Structure 1
Amino acid sequence: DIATIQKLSKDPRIVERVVASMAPSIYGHDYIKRALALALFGGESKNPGEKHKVRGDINLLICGDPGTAKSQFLKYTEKVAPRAVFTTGQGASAVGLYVRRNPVSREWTLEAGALVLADQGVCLIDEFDKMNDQDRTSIHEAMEQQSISISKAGIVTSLQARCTVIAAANPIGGRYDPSMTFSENVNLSEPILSRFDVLCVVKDEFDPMQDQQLAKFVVHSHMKHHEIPQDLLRQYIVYAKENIRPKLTNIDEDKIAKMYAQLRQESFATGSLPITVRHIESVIRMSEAHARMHLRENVMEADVSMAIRMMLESFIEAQKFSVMKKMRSTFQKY
């Protein structure tokens, strides 16, 4: 009962069976389900010669509603995924609990954060967006340079921060804006805007049929008194991000340039909120993520085109009532 993997793990329908074990909580919301599903085990170091170490990292973000269930989405991640720590918004001043090393004070206890304390894993945030700007400063390298570097003690040593990042914040403006622009929805400074990722949002409008469907599901959920189990896929992802080490090959990597141009030409000063050369490479992260969801190690148009599917949906998500830019632009792509 160990080939539990390879009695099943190679079917074509298993693109979506992973979604059924994210959080068995929500009727809707396939998108973030799939996004966290891929990003829980995706990753590649691909250290080229002496330059740098690229990423075992991503920052998916959902800036939704103050009270749509978001903070519950996070916990099953921890209850399956191998590492963590719990932290909520309003952490330290981002310094952390800068010591000088003496046998006075009996060693003047020592640490610098928690990405120092949990690398190549997770450690949790909730309800961030109403926190000290003096932390939104501080965490703003470890995400991408994946490197720490300190001073201001008896020492200037340095240490490794290879991680990813939880998101869990809260919007401003009451609940959530219309399709009117996003930079107006929550106001974070210019040199933080740099990185960005899996852009989803719990925008709400009322359907009574769906209200009936899910509410049946809810009361059914409240009616349990006394495809995948959590019994297994835990180990699938241990295996998947530990042992197999995927790749890429030239198949269609020029198409990426036309779509980046589709950003820059359809989006200049309307929506295109400095989404530089990190999210593009996050394209690759999705593709490599997909093939490790397959234990493939290479791929054809499939995985990359799935990345294009999801991104095409999202960037239509976060526009104006004029909401169909890449939609009209990609019926030919689609």
Structure 2
Amino acid sequence: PNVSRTIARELKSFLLEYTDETGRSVYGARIRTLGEMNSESLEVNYRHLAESKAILALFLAKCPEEMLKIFDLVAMEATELHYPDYARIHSEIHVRIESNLSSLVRVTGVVTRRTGVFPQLKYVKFLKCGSILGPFFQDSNEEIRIPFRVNGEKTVYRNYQRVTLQEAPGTVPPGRLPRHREVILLADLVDVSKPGEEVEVTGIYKNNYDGNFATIIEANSIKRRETEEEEREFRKISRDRGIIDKIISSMAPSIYGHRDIKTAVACSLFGGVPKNVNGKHSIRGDINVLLLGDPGTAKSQILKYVEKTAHRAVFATGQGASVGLTASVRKEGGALVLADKGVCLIDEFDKMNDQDRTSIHEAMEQQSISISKGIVTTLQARCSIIAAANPNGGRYNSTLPLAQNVSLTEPILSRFDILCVVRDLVDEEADERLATFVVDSHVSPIPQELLMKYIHYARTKIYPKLHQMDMDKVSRVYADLRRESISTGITVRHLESILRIAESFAKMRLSEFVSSYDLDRAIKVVVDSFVDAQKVSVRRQLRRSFAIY
């Protein structure tokens, strides 16, 4: 088909004047940002192409091969009319997008093992006819074959990688066995997946020529399974004051109340800062959440909300049913390796063995676990651990203490920062509100798309610091809290937690400076939380928590 010559003029009538939601040429506004970042990639939604001119959708399923070769070069010249000197960067931008041959296919799967990255010839130049032959094209997975021979020099290369992909164990019909298929990577997509993931790729489907037919999928657009005005309109809203209670009010509308423990969980995933001193040492960068449950609670529903909204979350089972959080060479990183700079979800400590005790022990303290294995490396782990426990026998035994109530030991609790505890007592109106909001559940807060851009945009950018004039009250708080709780029995790590929790409130305002309000909220959340763990004789502690305010 030679008509694509004339179609190249008209395919830019879609590129730079795609008027949707009052004009807004997302492609034309995007190109200046593409060459701005030198990403050498342009994204094309199948919705927009199907919406404007579906003749190209036919040109996708029938001939996806040469259509890209015609589309990317015109995108190159269409970008160079915008940037006069962009050809000095890369000068080539590749684009993104039996009944299966010669078509683009939306494919799912799980990443099996793979290989390294090698360069591959792109330009082929060739003693028979005097001098060299001339430039020729390096076919993909095929030779040129124009006596002469290819020389070592004068060869422009291209990085290559092939990726094995096998079927996803999640949508397997139950009991059958998975099968395999080949995926080959190209330039900007070099080594994008990682073992232990799922993936959704947009591939063109080919087959081998002859052997002396195996099919190979070359892939175009990798998307993982689930702009300028987008962050500035975002900043027009983020300037307000009452976002504190609103975050908890926008955190989890399924169960309506419980603002305190919901604010603590919302603070946990929002992160802390380890703040490595220049040359000296790094302290700790995570917030530790324990939530002592009760049968008869939808506390698990909360952590499921945590897993869908947050970045990397692998649900760690109750007892050995899964992944195992400790990487080990078996016939290879653990799930904690997947959750780097993310939040892990580990629960039901009552039924977890010592393997988990060592992994969780070292990971929340100083991030790295070593062995008595024939390889010696130090892989760290910056996970964030959120637990959900269960009381022994009764949900709450008596006035007897928390350490007497729980079956764990003291140092594992020491690794923990916050202790949110729920209570079960017969309230008539709470049951009324509960049943009525349940009815509403079967029928002002931030929409979930804005909050996900909020936490992702915040954790990559907001970097809290602190001044030296406001921590003296805090020093007095630690001094009275430790020195007065001597008669009670205490955590020095909770001293570091003060700054590491309070820094998140400055992360909430994206102000980079810790106001007094942040310290006051951090004190009013930590102190009373420690208060709630005692006996009925806590009245005295209630009568000394005034000076605390």
Identify the TM-score tier after normalising by the shorter chain. 0.7 to 0.9
Q: Which residue of 2 aligns with 1:60?
A: 289
Corresponding residue to 1:148 among 359, 363, 369? 369
Q: Rg larger in 1 or in 2? A: 2
CA distance change for structure 1 residues 192 and 312 in 2, over 3 Å: closer, same or farther? closer
SS class of match (2:235):
coil
SS class of match (1:194):
helix
Corresponding residue to 2:346 among 103, 109, 125? 125
2:286–2:364: 8 Å Cα contact kept in structure 1? yes
User: Taking structure 2 as the reference length, what is the TM-score of the superposition?
Assistant: 0.55
The CA distance in 2 between the partners of 1:151 and 1:313, in whole Å, is 43
Shift of 1:109: 4.8
Kindly report which structure 2 residues correspond to 1:1-334, keeping only aligned pairs within 5 A, or say none: 2=230, 3-91=232-320, 96=326, 98-99=328-329, 109-111=331-333, 113-152=334-373, 154-223=374-443, 227-268=445-486, 270=488, 272=489, 275-334=490-549
SS class of match (1:192):
helix
After superposition, give the CA deviation of every residue in 1:67-120 in whole Å (9 maximum; x if it has no partner).
322111101111111112122121379674743xxxxxxxx6533x32223211
The CA distance in 2 between the partners of 1:136 and 1:189, in whole Å, is 11
1:115–1:163: 8 Å Cα contact kept in structure 2? yes
Residue identity matched to 1:40: L
The CA distance in 2 between the partners of 1:297 and 1:66, in whole Å, is 41
The CA distance in 1 between the partners of 2:284 and 2:401, in whole Å, is 30
Residue identity matched to 1:313: D
SS class of match (1:248):
coil
After superposition, give the CA deviation of every residue in 1:112-149 in whole Å (9 maximum; x if it has no partner).
x3222321102322322222134223321111211232
CA distance change for structure 1 residues 35 and 190 in 2, over 3 Å: closer, same or farther? closer
Shift of 1:314: 1.1
User: Taking structure 1 as the reference length, what is the TM-score of the superposition?
Assistant: 0.88
Q: Which residue of 2 aligns with 1:105?
A: none
CA distance change for structure 1 residues 16 and 74 in 2, over 3 Å: closer, same or farther? same
CA distance change for structure 1 residues 110 and 38 in 2, over 3 Å: closer, same or farther? closer
Q: Which residue of 2 aligns with 1:102?
A: none
Count of matched residue positions in the alignment of Structure 1 and Structure 2: 318
CA distance change for structure 1 residues 281 and 219 in 2, over 3 Å: closer, same or farther? same
1:116–1:161: 8 Å Cα contact kept in structure 2? yes
Identity percentage over the alignment? 59
Residue identity matched to 2:332: L
CA distance change for structure 1 residues 140 and 82 in 2, over 3 Å: closer, same or farther? same
2:344–2:385: 8 Å Cα contact kept in structure 1? yes
The CA distance in 1 between the partners of 2:328 and 2:465, in whole Å, is 40
* Higher RCO by CA contacts (8 Å cutoff, separation 6 or greater): 1
After superposition, give the CA deviation of every residue in 1:161-190 in whole Å (9 maximum; x if it has no partner).
112102112111322233431111012224
RMSD: 2.1
SS class of match (1:199):
strand
Shift of 1:269: 5.3
The CA distance in 1 between the partners of 2:354 and 2:520, in whole Å, is 38
CA distance change for structure 1 residues 331 and 95 in 2, over 3 Å: closer, same or farther? closer
1:179–1:318: 8 Å Cα contact kept in structure 2? no
Q: Which residue of 1 aligns with 2:66?
A: none
